[PDB]
Amino acid sequence: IPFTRWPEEFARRYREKGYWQDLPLTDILTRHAASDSIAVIDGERQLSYRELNQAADNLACSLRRQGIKPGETALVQLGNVAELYITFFALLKLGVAPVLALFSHQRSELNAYASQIEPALLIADRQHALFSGDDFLNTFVTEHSSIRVVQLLNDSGEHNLQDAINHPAEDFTATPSPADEVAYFQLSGGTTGTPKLIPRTHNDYYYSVRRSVEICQFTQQTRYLCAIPAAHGYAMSSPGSLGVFLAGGTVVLAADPSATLCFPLIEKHQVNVTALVPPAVSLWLQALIEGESRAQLASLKLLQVGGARLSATLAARIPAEIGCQLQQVFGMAEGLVNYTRLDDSAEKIIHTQGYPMCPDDEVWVADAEGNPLPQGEVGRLMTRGPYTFRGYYKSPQHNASAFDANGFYCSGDLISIDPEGYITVQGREKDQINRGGEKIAAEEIENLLLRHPAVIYAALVSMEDELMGEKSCAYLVVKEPLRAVQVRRFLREQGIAEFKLPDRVECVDSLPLVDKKQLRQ
Numbered sequence: 165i166p167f168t169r170w171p172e173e174f175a176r177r178y179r180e181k182g183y184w185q186d187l188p189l190t191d192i193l194t195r196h197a198a199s200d201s202i203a204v205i206d207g208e209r210q211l212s213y214r215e216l217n218q219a220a221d222n223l224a225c226s227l228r229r230q231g232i233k234p235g236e237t238a239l240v241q242l243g244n245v246a247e248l249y250i251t252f253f254a255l256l257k258l259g260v261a262p263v264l265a266l267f268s269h270q271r272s273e274l275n276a277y278a279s280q281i282e283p284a285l286l287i288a289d290r291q292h293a294l295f296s297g298d299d300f301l302n303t304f305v306t307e308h309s310s311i312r313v314v315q316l317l318n319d320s321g322e323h324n325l326q327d328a329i330n331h332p333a334e335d336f337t338a339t340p341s342p343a344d345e346v347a348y349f350q351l352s353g354g355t356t357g358t359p360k361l362i363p364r365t366h367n368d369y370y371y372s373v374r375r376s377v378e379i380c381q382f383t384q385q386t387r388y389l390c391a392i393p394a395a396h397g398y399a400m401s402s403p404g405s406l407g408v409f410l411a412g413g414t415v416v417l418a419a420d421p422s423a424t425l426c427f428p429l430i431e432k433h434q435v436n437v438t439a440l441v442p443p444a445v446s447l448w449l450q451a452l453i454e455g456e457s458r459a460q461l462a463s464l465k466l467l468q469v470g471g472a473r474l475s476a477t478l479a480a481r482i483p484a485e486i487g488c489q490l491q492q493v494f495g496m497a498e499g500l501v502n503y504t505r506l507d508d509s510a511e512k513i514i515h516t517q518g519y520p521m522c523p524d525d526e527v528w529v530a531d532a533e534g535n536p537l538p539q540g541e542v543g544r545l546m547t548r549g550p551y552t553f554r555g556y557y558k559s560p561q562h563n564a565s566a567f568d569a570n571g572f573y574c575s576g577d578l579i580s581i582d583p584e585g586y587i588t589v590q591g592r593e594k595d596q597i598n599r600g601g602e603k604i605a606a607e608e609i610e611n612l613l614l615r616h617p618a619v620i621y622a623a624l625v626s627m628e629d630e631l632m633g634e635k636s637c638a639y640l641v642v643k644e645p646l647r648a649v650q651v652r653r654f655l656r657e658q659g660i661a662e663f664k665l666p667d668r669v670e671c672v673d674s675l676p677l678v679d680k681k682q683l684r685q
């Protein structure tokens with residue numbers, strides 16, 4: 165499986181300093197293979213580390229019998245369910261590199277993912293709109309003829325994922341990919357017209373998990389509510405579900421981050437850490453005002469907030485109105501993750517997004533050309549490090565643009581750095597909307613809008629929204645009258661995630677030639 169390697173002097177340095185430990189990610193689970201402490205709670209269901217590890221082997225083995233081999237890829241679309249973690253570890257034990265699609269992702273996204281990786285295996289959920297019938301499957305498995313095996317959650321027919329997990333592995337020995345080779349594929353937020361996949365090696369991904377655990381001081385006592393989409397890198401590795409498993413803690417799954425669902429789960433299971441995005445934090449504080457008992461969240465000792473910038477106003481209210489410590493998490497699926505420390509001054513936890521988790525994480529601030537700007541100046545985040553990648557998967561065209569000569573990645577974020585060395589996010593250069601933490605590639609949507617017969621020109625732009633931070637607005641120059649429902653219905657036919665539909669559509673007489681920079685003015 166081809167990916168951009170680190171130069172050898174970098175791989176050697178990162179091994180010498182102990183970042184790369186040359187262990188597979190399977191180690192996170194198999195160190196606990198003897199344990200009967202609870203690893204996953206999912207509604208009424210409680211899986212031990214022993215059971216989880218066994219489930220993973222059971223599935224890994226079942227797939228091996230169906231003829232899935234090491235070095236092959238897989239498309240996995242499971243939500244906030246135990247089977248996400250079983251499937252992730254099953255495929256890691258086989259040496260199969262998956263993409264973890266979010267439940268929200270639809271036709272266009274799955275097709276895009278399947279096209280780049282050419283998967284041998286598809287794992288999806290019959291509770292998904294696309295997988296309740298066999299119509300889409302028939303079409304999907306035709307277009308993506310690489311697919312040989314299909315396993316489906318909440319199926320009682322031939323392709324039942326349960327029957328595989330429940331089938332005890334006779335003599336199974338794991339064959340994880342080498343630790344300096346690809347383990348799995350993360351998803352970019354998106355700056356381009358097609359999704360870009362991020363190769364994560366065991367060495368790079370494990371270190372980010374291991375180092376995240378040190379900072380957030382996760383232990384066997386950690387009870388982590390995983391309420392955001394469980395397959396996202398923030399819920400997965402920062403420190404996320406894996407960080408919890410590593411530590412020997414417990415992951416509590418919730419279908420979404422509504423106060424309606426989570427407030428009960430936090431009190432019931434005595435959760436002491438969870439990860440949210442700004443709008444979820446807002447709705448939580450509003451739910452407390454609207455008269456939810458604050459004592460339901462007594463057990464909470466750390467609340468992570470990331471995916472998008474947290475207003476100091478919102479930040480300051482977390483200790484007061486909820487009564488736990490805040491951690492701001494500024495990270496990206498490409499690698500680099502900045503944390504506030506648990507011992508940081510209120511000043512840094514409220515007004516900054518921390519500093520990189522690795523001492524050998526390297527961060528300078530570029531001007532429009534690409535020269536270093538001195539501290540306190542605002543400019544483009546340029547970074548490289550032991551868990552920051554060196555190329556999207558099979559993207560020589562975009563990789564040329566995305567990295568400078570020395571292998572520094574531009575995140576398309578604008579940042580300043582304090583005298584104390586802390587990063588504050590000041591804005592964004594990449595053509596990306598941040599819809600309450602969820603990322604939309606403006607180009608992806610503009611291309612889809614231009615497919616519409618009435619649409620001459622398309623501009624997708626951010627607009628301030630108090631709840632979400634940003635909402636999508638589609639500016640269209642049209643042949644004929646076009647109402648928002650028509651645009652939205654049309655885009656849903658193309659088959660994309662709901663969050664990607666423009667919250668607002670406006671037909672205008674002209675757009676400038678699109679110069680989005682001027683359209684803001």
Ligand SMILES: Cc1c(Cl)cccc1C(=O)NS(=O)(=O)OC[C@H]1O[C@@H](n2cnc3c(N)ncnc32)[C@H](O)[C@@H]1O
Nearest residue numbers: 353397398402470471472473493494495496497575589
């Ligand atoms: C991967 C990730 C982790 Cl592991 C932890 C927290 C957030 C993310 C994340 O944001 N992942 S991402 O791939 O979906 O998007 C990366 C982009 O998300 C934005 N972002 C993430 N955290 C922030 C933040 N705290 N403040 C402002 N912007 C933020 C930023 O533009 C960054 O380039």
